[PDB]
Point group: D2
């Protein structure tokens, strides 16, 4: 589909980032993946990010990305599929063209690798990756790639296929300036780890959707929080935050990387063979897994 169309889809509901399934030997497990992505389909997320950060993008071989994307596409049905992209320009450009060719509906451009870079250089990097493909591009402020409002405005004026902005910084002052400056030029996506913790402040800042990583294993709970959010049903959001999200937070905050590892542990506990994380993440301990299973509780998928 074309950039305005993916842009419209980005603004039509909740966004989900499927974990990437590995077998015991750490290779992509395509059968398990599709199974999980077919189950998630029944909850009608309007866009699926294939091989985002929740899907361990930063551990994928570049030649694995198009394969994971095409697996998602087989069973996604009516759902727009966006692929992770990143690294420096030369690799990002080759990934981007590889996933356009397998029918991706857009790319999510995660940060370049290792260095701190001036604004001039970011602009130069992102402009060239956007110019390498015809499909929709979402940029992604975090860690070593943080676009200022001025710089983002220049990219938008020069790159019409640039249609969205994912935030992972937590920088409220900055993202409110970005939405004021750009208005409806971009779709704004909340992208913090466990974004429901931020959804209500971000609405206020002008973000009406976010990525929900926990949708991976409790989508009905994630769909309820989202509908509560958009309906102004504040007692309901608060209940779900105190009862599920803060307790999930405390498990997540036990180790670095658990913003991905606790989520994939959740998938497995709900009966999907998602398998281990790739190093250098580590998987939850048996105790920790037990704490997660207990928390899932009434929202268990099987016995």
């Amino acid at each position: 589909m074309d950039p305005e169309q993916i842009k419209t889809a980005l603004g039509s509901g909740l966004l989900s980032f499927p974990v990437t399934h590995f077998d015991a030997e750490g290779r992509f497990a395509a059968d398990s993946y599709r199974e999980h992505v077919e189950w998630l389909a029944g909850y009608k997320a309007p866009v699926l990010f294939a091989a985002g950060g929740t899907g361990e993008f930063f551990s994928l071989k570049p030649d694995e990305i198009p394969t994971i994307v095409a697996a998602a596409k087989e069973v996604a049905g009516e759902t727009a599929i966006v692929s992770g992209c990143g690294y420096g320009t030369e690799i990002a450009v080759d990934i981007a063209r590889s996933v356009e060719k397998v029918g991706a509906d857009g790319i999510l451009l995660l940060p370049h690798y290792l260095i701190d870079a001036p604004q001039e250089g970011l602009y130069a990097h992102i402009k060239k990756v956007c110019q390498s493909v015809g499909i929709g591009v979402m940029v992604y402020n975090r860690d070593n790639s943080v676009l200022q409002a001025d710089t983002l405005a220049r990219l938008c004026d020069e790159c019409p296929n640039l249609v969205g902005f994912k935030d992972g910084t937590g920088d409220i002052g900055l993202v409110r300036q970005i939405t004021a400056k750009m208005g409806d030029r971009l779709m704004y996506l909340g992208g913090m780890p466990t974004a429901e913790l931020f959804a209500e402040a971000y609405l206020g800042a002008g973000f009406t959707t976010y990525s929900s990583a926990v949708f991976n294993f409790v989508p009905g709970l994630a769909n309820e929080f989202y509908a509560a959010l958009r309906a102004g049903e504040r007692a309901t959001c608060e209940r779900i935050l105190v009862d599920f999200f803060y307790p999930f937070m405390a498990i997540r905050n036990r180790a670095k990387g658990y913003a991905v590892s606790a989520v994939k542990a959740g998938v497995r506990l709900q009966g999907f063979n998602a398998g281990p994380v790739r190093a250098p993440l580590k998987d939850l301990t048996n105790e920790e897994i037990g704490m997660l299973e207990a928390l899932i509780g009434t929202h268990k998928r099987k016995a």
Copy 2:
């Protein structure tokens, strides 16, 4: 008034923090201060925080604190007056008691001095201060003193006169957890130095109200933003953000401390002899003062 009356007043509208006036040699300038605070109460702020952060508390002798609150009280009117408080426990207590005596309606407890501290140490600190007076306390999250939700809730149980929380961390995740937990046990105050930039997200996070530093010199514009915010006029909020606050932001970010120095310069430009900042702040250059003068423009008194 008692803790619960200040609690109510704290949530009843826009809050402000008058800068502290000095003459040239350096001492507090009571006549000027009184004439500035009186002009502010006229723009109907419910609460006024004398010698707070914006009022250069961090640069004030313990002895000076009661004189400033006293000055403010003389001309406040219906507006309630909350006093800055701070430093280590021993000095904080002494300051707390001194301002209660001159009739402070409340304390804003700024962080202790220098050290990092464990949560259990912060608990002891803040407890000891709350218990030394009978008026209401507002704690203040920023820098080397950041209360976690559970620690905070322990204080709220232990100390019924702790009625308010001010944020200056911008940690939007932490403060939504704090409101979600404590609920109506506390009033929640937006406290970033230029809080209009954070006010729409703060209210999403459940925040009762926020404080406007720039109210010091453009109270009419602060009040404009504030009413549009409460009535949901996103586009008016947005115009005032783009035309005034982000340009103010670009002046403030030119130097450290200018969250105070540029507000103060703002006040001088409107005809109040606020005098300079005390070291180690520095005043705006003549260039920067003119930038700010140009930006105030139509609101010029």
Copy 3:
């Protein structure tokens, strides 16, 4: 003494910062202070910092400091005495003066309160404070008060009594530039928590000496380490680090503020009546004091 005399004394041996004894009701216990300090003089440190950070300057009332400094000077011997100083400019002079009038040989100017400030502002603050007295001043780079080399040079050419420089930043690049630019105009005191971990590096960076907090309770080990350091016996320095210091670090790292707390726990272990820390510090749990007692071991003071 005059400023050049405390300068001299400062670079002539190993410095330390005695903890302040409080009785359990919370007041300064000058009896135990003198009995603790008397014991430390016998281990021959040439300058002594009364009411500094290790001595909880940050929790002291401005009135308690001359009292503490006097309590120190009485049993000090010919050992020199430097007082803490700090907070805003206005409180800082009041404190500086008050401690000069009770014989303080000099002053350690801890950072101002709370705010970040511009270099020019740090300059006006420190300048005025140096000019309020006639005894020697040593500046202290940490947290919200970090002087760049050019600023520090300016203060040195304005205030002849400013003669020492304590680092608490751990910034090698900066303090090497300070010692290269300033030369022997300043005496450079290594000032990290548990500065021994840092001493071998700070010598290479041009630092005359450092302060030992653990001198407080194991001043035998402190002189053994300092001595080996100066004679170039690396294998002996390295022993005491692997055997004492990285274990003491693992305890000190259990909690915020334990850079003082674990030190004041060590003092009470050797049997001095130090008593509690003042909030917002806390004391080590008994389990932790047990940990500490096992580590002090052979060095435990004996009747």
Copy 4:
């Protein structure tokens, strides 16, 4: 060579990291690259790192790194050639084997990509890269990959070809702990941007040597600071810090990424056609290059 041999080479002198030369179209420029590297050979650095960070590793395609290592190997002489390597485990392993295969004498393993990771994960990732090759491996503490002393011990016990440790943190407390614990099990390389600013404190902390980005364009000056350091000529070191390094430091701090861009501009100013940086770095302005050229001064290799 084998790992102990590269360990020895690493310990034996000043080390350097050549910039990677690109033509105007951003492609690898090998004629210019080997020309520059032949010059660096005259100054006898015992180890050369091809496609390290100063060499813009983080902007190279993996298929480019072997070609770069082979180019430098043509004209390096008896200098050890070590290859950059990095990203996450799968890519890192591939790069490692590709450069082993073109004859690299070791690899320097830059951090994995993007994420903060627990110590157990770093252990697992690094162990797997080391096990993929027979050549010597140097680990590199910086940014999102900072090994503790106890983790590195466990890697050292498990991976005999892991022989070196490069520091990019400036965390003196932690790097002293690491040398105290590991001893001569490892050689220690100082690796801060503009490491001369740090060299004297790092030896004190027991670091076997360091690497000099600026040696790219004033090797003569870098060699003399290095000999002065090893002979304890403090005054000589200090004159070179005040006259050249802090001034270079003021140029380098004008923009992010100029720890690499300022160095490449220096190479260009000495008549080696290094070409531009790849985004997201940016090149010094014409003005800034002017500042650099005046600073180089008496150390010019050419007249234009």
